Design a protein around this ligand. Structure first.
Ligand SMILES: [Cu+2]
Length: 128
């Protein structure tokens, strides 16, 4: 809604949106991640990670590398403009960030970093 979106990460390796919209007149933007289903974080955990489209794969491949105890993101990966933490079924985690970190004329991509998840769980974030 007002300066934030609710997104669902389920048991079928999905996000219920591939296009996140951000009103320019938002000083900050909040994302509230939610996980319906009964699979554990260690079997079907998701996160919400944001970067440019050029950096997405680096962030994914490195996040792949770091492991489960790093939530499948690289420590202080400066390619990450913001990210929620890894959540299992029934859990929730929200993230908030400076809307000014999204520079005009750039391509931004949200995605889930566990192994193979981004292939279905990825999308565009737009600073309309
Ligand atoms: Cu995922």
């Amino acid at each position: 809604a007002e300066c934030s979106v609710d997104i669902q990460g389920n048991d079928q390796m999905q996000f219920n949106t591939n296009a996140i919209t951000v009103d320019k007149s938002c000083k900050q933007f909040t994302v509230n991640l939610s996980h319906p289903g009964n699979l554990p974080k260690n079997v079907m955990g998701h996160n919400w990670v944001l970067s440019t489209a050029a950096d997405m794969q680096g962030v994914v491949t490195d996040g792949m590398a770091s492991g489960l105890d790093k939530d499948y993101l690289k420590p202080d990966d400066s390619r990450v403009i913001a990210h929620t933490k890894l959540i299992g079924s029934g859990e929730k985690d929200s993230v908030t960030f400076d809307v000014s970190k999204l520079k005009e004329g750039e391509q931004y991509m949200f995605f889930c970093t566990p192994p193979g998840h981004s292939a279905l769980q990825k999308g565009t974030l737009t600073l309309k």
